[PDB]
Tab-separated table of C-alpha atoms (C1' of nucleotides) and ligand atoms in Angstrom:
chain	number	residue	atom	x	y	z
A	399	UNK	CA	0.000	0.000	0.000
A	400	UNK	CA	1.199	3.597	-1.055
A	401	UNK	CA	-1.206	5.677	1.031
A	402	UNK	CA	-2.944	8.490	0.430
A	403	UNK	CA	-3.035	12.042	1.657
A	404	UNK	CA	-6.960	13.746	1.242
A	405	UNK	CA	-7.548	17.487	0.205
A	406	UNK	CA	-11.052	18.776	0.344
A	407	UNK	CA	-11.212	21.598	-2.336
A	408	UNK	CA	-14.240	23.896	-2.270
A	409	UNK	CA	-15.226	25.366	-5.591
A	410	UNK	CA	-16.938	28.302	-6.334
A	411	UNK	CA	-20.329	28.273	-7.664
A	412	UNK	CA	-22.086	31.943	-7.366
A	413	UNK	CA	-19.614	34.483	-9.164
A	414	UNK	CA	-20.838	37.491	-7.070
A	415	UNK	CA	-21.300	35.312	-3.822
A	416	UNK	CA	-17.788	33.352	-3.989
A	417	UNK	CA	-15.773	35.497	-5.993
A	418	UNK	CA	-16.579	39.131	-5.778
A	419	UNK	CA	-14.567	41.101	-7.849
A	420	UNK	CA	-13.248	38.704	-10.041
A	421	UNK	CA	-12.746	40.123	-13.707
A	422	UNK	CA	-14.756	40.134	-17.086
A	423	UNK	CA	-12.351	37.781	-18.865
A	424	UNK	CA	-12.522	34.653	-16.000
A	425	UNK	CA	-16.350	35.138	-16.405
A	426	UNK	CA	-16.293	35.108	-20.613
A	427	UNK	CA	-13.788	31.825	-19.682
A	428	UNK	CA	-16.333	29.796	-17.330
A	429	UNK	CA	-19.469	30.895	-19.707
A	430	UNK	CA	-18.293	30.106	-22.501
A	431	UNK	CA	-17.498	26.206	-21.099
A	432	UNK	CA	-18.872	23.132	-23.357
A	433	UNK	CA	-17.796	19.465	-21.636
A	434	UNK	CA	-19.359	16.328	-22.706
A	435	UNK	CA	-18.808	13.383	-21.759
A	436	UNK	CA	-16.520	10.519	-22.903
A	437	UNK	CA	-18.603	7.689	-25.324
A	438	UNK	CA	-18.380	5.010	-22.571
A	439	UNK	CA	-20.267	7.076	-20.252
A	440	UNK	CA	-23.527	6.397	-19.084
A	441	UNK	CA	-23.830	9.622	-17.410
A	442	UNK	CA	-26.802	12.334	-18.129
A	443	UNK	CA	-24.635	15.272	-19.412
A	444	UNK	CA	-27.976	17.505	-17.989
A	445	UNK	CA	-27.021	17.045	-14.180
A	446	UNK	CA	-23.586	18.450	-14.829
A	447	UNK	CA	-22.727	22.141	-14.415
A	448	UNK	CA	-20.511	23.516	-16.458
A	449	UNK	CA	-19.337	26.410	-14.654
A	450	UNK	CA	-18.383	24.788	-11.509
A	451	UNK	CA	-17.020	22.273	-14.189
A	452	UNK	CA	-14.244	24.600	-16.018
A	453	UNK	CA	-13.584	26.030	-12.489
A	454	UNK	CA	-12.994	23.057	-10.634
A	455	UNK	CA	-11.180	20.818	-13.981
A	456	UNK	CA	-8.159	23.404	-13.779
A	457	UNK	CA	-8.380	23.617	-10.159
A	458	UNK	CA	-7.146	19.681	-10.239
A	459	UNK	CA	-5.253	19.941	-13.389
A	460	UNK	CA	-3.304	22.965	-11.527
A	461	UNK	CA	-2.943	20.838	-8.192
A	462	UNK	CA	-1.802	17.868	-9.563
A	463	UNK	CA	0.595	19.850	-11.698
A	464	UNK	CA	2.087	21.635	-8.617
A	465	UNK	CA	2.184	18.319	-6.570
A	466	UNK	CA	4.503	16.784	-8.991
A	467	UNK	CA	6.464	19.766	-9.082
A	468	UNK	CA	6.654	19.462	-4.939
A	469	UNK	CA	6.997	15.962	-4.471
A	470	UNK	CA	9.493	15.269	-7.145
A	471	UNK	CA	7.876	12.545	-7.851
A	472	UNK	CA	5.546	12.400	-11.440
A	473	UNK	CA	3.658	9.140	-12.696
A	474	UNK	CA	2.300	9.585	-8.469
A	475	UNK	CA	-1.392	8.059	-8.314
A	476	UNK	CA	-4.309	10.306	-8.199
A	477	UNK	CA	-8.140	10.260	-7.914
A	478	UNK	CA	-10.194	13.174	-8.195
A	479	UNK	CA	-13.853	13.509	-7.562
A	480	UNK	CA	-15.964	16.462	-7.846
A	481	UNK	CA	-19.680	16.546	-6.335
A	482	UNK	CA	-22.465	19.034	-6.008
A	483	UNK	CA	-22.687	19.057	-2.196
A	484	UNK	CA	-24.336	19.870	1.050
A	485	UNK	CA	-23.671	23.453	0.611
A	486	UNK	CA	-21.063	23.654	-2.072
A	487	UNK	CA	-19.464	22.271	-5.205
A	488	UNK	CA	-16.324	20.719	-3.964
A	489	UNK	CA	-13.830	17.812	-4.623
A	490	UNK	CA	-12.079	15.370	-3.048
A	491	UNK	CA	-8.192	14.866	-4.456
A	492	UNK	CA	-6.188	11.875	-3.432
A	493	UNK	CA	-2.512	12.015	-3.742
A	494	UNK	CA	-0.045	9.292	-3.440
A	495	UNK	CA	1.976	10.063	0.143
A	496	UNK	CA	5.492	9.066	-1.448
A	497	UNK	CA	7.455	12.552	-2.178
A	498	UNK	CA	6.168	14.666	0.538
A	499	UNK	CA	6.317	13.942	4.493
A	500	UNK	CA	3.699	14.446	6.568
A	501	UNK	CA	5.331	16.920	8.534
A	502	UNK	CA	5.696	19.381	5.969
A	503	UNK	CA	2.262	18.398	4.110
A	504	UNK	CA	0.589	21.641	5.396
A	505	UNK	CA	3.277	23.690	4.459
A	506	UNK	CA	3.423	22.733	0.953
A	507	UNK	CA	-0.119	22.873	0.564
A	508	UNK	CA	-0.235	26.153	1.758
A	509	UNK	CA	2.428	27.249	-1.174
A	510	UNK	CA	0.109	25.644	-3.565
A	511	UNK	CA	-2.470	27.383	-2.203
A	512	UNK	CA	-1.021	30.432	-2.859
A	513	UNK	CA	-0.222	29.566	-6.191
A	514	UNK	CA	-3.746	28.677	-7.001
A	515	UNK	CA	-4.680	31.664	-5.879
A	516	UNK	CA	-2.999	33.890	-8.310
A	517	UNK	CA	-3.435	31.472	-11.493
A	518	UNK	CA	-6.856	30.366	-11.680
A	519	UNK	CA	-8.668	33.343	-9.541
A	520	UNK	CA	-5.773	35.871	-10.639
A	521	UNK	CA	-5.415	37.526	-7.231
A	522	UNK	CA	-8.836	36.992	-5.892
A	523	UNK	CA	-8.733	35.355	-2.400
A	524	UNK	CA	-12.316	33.358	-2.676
A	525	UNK	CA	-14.740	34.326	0.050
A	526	UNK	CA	-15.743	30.536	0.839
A	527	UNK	CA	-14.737	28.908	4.201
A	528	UNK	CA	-12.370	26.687	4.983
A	529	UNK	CA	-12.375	25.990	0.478
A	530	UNK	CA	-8.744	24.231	0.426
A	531	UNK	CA	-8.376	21.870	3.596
A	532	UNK	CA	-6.235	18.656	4.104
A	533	UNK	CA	-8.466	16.303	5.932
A	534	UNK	CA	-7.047	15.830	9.436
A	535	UNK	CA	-7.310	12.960	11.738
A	536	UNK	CA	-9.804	13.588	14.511
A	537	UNK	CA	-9.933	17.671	14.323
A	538	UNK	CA	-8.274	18.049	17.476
A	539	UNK	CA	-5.193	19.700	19.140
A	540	UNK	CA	-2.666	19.508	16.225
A	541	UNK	CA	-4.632	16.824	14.642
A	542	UNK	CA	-2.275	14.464	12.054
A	543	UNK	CA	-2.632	14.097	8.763
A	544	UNK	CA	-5.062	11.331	8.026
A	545	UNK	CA	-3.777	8.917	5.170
A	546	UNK	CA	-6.183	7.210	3.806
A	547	UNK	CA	-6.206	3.710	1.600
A	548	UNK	CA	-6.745	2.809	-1.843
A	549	UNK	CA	-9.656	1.402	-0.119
A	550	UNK	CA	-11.147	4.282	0.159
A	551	UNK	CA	-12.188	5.234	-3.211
A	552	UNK	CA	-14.906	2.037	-2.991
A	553	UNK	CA	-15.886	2.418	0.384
A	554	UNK	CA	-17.070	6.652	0.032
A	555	UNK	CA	-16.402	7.738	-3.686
A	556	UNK	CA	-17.521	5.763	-6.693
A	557	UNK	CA	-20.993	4.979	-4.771
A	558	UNK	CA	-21.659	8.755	-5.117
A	559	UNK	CA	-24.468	9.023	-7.894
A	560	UNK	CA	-25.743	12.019	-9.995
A	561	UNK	CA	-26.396	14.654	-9.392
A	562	UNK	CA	-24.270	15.085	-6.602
A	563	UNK	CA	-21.553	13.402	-8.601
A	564	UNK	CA	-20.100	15.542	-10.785
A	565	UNK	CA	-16.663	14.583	-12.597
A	566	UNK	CA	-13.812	12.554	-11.614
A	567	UNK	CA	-9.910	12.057	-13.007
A	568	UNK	CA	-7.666	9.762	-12.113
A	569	UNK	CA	-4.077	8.248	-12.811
A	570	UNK	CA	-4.983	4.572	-11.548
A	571	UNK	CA	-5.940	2.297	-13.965
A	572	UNK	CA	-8.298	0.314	-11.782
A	573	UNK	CA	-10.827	3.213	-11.764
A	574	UNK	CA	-10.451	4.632	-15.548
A	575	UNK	CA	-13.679	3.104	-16.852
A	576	UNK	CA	-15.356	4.068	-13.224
A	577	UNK	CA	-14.655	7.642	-13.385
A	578	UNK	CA	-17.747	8.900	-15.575
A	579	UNK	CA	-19.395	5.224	-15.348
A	580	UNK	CA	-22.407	4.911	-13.302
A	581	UNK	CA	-22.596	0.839	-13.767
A	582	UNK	CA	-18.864	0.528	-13.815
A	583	UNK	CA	-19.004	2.073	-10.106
A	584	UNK	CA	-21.994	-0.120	-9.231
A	585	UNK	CA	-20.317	-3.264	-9.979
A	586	UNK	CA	-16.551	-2.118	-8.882
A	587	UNK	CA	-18.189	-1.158	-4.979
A	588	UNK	CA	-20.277	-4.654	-5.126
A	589	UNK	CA	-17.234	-6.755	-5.789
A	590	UNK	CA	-15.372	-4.658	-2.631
A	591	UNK	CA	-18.490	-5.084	-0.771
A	592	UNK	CA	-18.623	-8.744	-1.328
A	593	UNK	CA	-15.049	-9.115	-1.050
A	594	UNK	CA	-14.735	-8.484	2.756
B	351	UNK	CA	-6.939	64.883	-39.082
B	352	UNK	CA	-6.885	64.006	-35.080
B	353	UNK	CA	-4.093	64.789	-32.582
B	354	UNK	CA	-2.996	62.097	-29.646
B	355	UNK	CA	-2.953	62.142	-26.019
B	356	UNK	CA	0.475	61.010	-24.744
B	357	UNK	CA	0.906	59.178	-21.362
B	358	UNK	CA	4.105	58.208	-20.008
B	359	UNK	CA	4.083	54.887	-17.788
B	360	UNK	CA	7.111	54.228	-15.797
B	361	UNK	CA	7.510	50.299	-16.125
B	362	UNK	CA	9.237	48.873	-12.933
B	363	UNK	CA	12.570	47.380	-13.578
B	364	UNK	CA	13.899	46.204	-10.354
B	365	UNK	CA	11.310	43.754	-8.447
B	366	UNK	CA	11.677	44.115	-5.066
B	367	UNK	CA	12.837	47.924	-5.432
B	368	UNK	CA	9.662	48.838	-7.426
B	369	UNK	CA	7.077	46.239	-6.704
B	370	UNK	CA	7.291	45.583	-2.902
B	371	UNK	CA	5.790	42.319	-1.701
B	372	UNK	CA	4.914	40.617	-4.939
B	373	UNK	CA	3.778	37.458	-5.346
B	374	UNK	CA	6.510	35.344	-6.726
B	375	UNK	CA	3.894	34.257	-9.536
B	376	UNK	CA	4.534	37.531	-10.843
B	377	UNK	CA	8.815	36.753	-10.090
B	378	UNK	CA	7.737	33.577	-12.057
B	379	UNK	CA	6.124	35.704	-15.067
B	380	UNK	CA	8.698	37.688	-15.882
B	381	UNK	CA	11.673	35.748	-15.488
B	382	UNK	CA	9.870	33.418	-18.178
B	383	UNK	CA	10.979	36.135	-20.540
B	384	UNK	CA	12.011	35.311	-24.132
B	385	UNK	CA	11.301	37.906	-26.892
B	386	UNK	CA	12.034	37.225	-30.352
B	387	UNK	CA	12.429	39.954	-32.767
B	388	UNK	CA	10.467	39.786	-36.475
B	389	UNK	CA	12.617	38.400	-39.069
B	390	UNK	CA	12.072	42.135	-40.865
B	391	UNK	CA	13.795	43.668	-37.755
B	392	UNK	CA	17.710	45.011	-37.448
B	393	UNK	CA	18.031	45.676	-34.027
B	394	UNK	CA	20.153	43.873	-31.313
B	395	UNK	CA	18.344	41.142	-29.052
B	396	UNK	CA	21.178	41.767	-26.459
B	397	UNK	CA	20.118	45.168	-25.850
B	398	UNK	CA	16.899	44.719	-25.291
B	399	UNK	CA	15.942	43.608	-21.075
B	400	UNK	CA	13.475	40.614	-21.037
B	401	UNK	CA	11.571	40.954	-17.976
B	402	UNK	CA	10.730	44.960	-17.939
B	403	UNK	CA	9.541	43.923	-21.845
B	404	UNK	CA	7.462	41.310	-20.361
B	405	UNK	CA	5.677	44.214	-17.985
B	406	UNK	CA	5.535	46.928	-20.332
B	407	UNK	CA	4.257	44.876	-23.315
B	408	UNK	CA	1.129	43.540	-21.256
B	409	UNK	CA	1.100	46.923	-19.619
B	410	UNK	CA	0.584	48.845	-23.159
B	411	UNK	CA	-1.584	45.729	-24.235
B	412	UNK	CA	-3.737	46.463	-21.881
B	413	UNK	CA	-4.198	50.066	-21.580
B	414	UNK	CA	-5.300	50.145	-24.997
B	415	UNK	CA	-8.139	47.448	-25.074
B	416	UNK	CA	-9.282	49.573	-21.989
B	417	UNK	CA	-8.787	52.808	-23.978
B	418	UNK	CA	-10.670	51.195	-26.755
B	419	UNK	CA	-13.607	50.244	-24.332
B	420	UNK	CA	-13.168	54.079	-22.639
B	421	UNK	CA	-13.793	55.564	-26.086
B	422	UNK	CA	-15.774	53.135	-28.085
B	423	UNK	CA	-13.513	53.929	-30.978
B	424	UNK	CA	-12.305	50.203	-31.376
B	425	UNK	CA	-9.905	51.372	-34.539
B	426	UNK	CA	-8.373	54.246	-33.202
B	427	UNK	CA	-4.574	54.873	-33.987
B	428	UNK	CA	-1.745	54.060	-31.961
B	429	UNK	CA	2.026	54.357	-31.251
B	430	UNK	CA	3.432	53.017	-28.464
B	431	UNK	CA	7.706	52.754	-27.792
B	432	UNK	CA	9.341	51.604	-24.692
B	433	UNK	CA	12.274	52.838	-23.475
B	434	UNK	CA	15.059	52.429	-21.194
B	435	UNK	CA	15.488	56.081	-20.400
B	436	UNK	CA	17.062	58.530	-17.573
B	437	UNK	CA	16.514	56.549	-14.422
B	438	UNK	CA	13.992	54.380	-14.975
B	439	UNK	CA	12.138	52.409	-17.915
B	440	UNK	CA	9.257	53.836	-19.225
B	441	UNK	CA	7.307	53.749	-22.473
B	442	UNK	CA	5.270	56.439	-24.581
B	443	UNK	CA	1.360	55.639	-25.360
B	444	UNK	CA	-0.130	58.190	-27.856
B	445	UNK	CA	-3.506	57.450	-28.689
B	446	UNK	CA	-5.958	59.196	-31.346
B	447	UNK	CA	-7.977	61.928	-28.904
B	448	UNK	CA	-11.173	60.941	-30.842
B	449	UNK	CA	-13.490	59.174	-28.297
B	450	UNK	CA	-12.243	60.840	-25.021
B	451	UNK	CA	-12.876	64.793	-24.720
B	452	UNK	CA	-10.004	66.452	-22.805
B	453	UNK	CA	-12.217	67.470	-19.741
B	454	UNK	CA	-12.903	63.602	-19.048
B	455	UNK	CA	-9.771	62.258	-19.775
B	456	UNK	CA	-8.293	62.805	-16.480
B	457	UNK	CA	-10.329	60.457	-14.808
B	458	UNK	CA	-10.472	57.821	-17.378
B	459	UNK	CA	-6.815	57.481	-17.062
B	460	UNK	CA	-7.420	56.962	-13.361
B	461	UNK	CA	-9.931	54.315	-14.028
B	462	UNK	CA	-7.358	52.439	-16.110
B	463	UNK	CA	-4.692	52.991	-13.985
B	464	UNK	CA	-6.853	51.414	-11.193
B	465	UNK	CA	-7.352	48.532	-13.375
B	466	UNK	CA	-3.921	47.835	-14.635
B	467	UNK	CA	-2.738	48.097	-10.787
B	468	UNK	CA	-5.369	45.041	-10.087
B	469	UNK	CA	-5.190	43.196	-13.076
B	470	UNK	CA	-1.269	43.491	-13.662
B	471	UNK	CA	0.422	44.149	-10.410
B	472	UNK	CA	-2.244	42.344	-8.393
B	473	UNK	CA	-2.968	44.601	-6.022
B	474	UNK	CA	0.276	46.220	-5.639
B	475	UNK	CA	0.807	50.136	-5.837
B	476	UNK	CA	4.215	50.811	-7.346
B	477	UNK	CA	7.024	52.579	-5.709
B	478	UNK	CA	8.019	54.452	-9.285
B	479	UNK	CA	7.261	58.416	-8.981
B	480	UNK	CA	5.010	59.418	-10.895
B	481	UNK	CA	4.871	56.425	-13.254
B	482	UNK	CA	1.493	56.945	-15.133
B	483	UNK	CA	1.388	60.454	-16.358
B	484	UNK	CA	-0.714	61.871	-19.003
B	485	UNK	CA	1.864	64.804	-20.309
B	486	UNK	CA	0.066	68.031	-19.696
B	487	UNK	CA	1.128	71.434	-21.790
B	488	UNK	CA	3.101	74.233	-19.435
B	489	UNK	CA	2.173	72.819	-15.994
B	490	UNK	CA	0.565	75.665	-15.217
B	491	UNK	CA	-2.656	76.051	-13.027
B	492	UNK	CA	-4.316	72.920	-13.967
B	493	UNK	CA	-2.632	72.341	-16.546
B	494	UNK	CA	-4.098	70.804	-20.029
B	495	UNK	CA	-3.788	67.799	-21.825
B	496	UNK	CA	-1.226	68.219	-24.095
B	497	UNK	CA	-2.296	67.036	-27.554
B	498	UNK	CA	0.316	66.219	-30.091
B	499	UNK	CA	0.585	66.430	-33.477
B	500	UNK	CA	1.682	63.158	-35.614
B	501	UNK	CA	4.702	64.593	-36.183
B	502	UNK	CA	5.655	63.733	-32.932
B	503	UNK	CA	6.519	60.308	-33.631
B	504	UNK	CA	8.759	61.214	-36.085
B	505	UNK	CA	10.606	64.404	-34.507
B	506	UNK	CA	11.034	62.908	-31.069
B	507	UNK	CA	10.127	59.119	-31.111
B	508	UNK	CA	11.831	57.444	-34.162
B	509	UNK	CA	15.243	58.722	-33.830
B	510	UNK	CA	16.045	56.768	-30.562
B	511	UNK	CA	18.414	54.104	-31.180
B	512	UNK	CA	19.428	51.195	-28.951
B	513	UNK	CA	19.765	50.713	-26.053
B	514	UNK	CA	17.749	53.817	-25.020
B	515	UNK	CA	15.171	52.225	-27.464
B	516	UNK	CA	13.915	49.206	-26.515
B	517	UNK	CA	10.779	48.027	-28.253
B	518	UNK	CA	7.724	49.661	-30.063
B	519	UNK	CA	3.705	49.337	-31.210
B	520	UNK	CA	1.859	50.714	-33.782
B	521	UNK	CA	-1.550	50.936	-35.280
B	522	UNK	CA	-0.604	52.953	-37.875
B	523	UNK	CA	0.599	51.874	-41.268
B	524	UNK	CA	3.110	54.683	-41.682
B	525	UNK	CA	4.866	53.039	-39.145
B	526	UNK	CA	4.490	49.394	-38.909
B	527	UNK	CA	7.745	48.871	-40.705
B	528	UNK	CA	9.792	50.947	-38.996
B	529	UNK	CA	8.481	49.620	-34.926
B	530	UNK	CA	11.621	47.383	-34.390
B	531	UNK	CA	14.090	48.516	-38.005
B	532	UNK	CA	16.441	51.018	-37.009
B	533	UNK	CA	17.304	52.043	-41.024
B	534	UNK	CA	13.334	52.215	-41.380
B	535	UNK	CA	13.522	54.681	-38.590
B	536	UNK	CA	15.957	56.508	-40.005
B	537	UNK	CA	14.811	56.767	-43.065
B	538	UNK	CA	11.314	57.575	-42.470
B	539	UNK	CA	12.947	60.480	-39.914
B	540	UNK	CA	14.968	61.893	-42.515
B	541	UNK	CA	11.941	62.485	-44.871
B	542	UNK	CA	10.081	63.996	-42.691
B	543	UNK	CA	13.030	66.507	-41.912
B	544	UNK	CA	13.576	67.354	-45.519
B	545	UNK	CA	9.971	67.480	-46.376
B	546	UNK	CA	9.324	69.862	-43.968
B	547	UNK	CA	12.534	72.326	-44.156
B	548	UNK	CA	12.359	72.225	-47.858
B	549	UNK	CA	8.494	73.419	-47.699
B	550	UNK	CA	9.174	75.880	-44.742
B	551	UNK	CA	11.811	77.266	-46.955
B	552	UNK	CA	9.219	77.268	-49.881
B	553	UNK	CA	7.283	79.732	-47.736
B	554	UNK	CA	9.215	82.658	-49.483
B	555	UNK	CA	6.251	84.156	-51.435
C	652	DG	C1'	8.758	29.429	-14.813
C	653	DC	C1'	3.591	32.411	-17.612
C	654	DT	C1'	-0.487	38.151	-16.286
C	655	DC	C1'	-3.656	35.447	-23.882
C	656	DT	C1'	-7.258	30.017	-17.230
C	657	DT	C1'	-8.852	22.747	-21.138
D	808	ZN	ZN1	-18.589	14.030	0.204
D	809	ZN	ZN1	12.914	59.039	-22.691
DNA sequence: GCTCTT
């Protein structure tokens, strides 16, 4: 097992309530957004926004980008699910641990952070709360950096149906067919189900 | 024809002198820097400073799509040359006066300013003096906007020669050759001077 | 490196 760290990603959804002040060209580039999906996708393209969409798509493109850069260490698995939420559009990223020490994990994300910041909202701090967090261990006094298993993509993602599932990347080639597949998820999370 | 409004922007040169405190995506940016010139062009590449390019280029870029919005005159002429100059970098705008009466102008240029500060520097005011300055005429009581006839791009602009000159923009055709060709420039600048001593001197009866 | 956002 590899291990994975968890970052919760929050993204924005209401232009004037999440991003006040953000300029006329970032909202010509989210409005002007056509995705469809893959041909072996069973997916209904009409529960899918494409705002959030654009937004969100370079948000991981841009993280995972940066996280190679920091951990020295490309070719590192990923998985990547975005979901319409309780509240808000957010998604869950899985990196591979291997290239950055858990120590340091909240310092680096921080500086990518940061980066983020000034390349896909070009200065614009986004007003929601708590929108780029590293899921902790049991939210106490210093906490620790929960790592999670590959397990864990069975046991709380792929069972996620539309509409709050959104999108979803990923390097591993165990989940490629699952990411936009509704029935590929159904049958992956019965065969981990069973197989326990 | 139409005269031009000229405003001189310092372009910051030295990060942290100039541009306290920014991000190091914008230290990223600009040391990123390669310029190429045109095939058609005769000037030096190793006179010519990559990163204040990188600045002043968007900088100019920018101030005239929001000059073009400002005066919904989308064509209007342009001449634009950067220059490494006294003390600091800066870089001569003249833009075509039609769109923008002189009594409004003022605070247009403040609106853009505003908006290059956010969209460009991000936020952060720079520490050049006085480095966006429409030119005004005798600096008198209030002033007035100084508006200058097309011969000022040949008279003053066109003779500079590396490495006080360091790159140029035009709209106008008269001058698209000669932006980055230093014998264009001097050839276009020595017809103009003849032309117009010859016909001064013609001006006896 | 990226201020012309897959
Ligand atoms: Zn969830
Ligand atoms: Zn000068």
């Amino acid at each position: 097992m590899p291990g994975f760290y968890e970052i919760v990603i929050k993204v924005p959804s209401d232009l004037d309530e999440h991003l006040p002040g953000i300029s006329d060209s970032f909202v010509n580039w989210v409005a002007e957004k056509e995705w469809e999906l893959p041909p072996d996708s069973d997916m209904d393209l009409n529960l899918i926004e494409q705002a959030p969409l654009t937004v969100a798509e370079k948000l991981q493109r841009d993280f995972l980008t940066e996280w190679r850069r920091v951990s020295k260490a490309p070719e590192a698995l990923f998985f990547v699910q975005f979901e319409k939420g309780e509240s808000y559009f957010h998604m869950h990223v899985l990196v591979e641990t291997t290239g950055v020490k858990s120590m340091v994990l909240g310092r680096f994300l921080s500086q990518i952070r940061e980066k983020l910041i000034q390349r896909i909202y070009r200065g614009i701090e986004p007003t929601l709360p708590n929108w780029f967090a590293v899921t902790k261990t049991r939210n106490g006094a210093g906490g620790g950096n929960k790592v999670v298993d590959e397990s864990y993509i069975p046991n709380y993602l792929l069972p996620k149906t539309q509409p709050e599932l959104q999108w979803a990347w990923t390097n591993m080639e165990q989940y490629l067919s699952a990411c936009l597949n509704l029935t590929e998820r159904k049958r992956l999370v019965a065969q981990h189900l069973t197989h326990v």
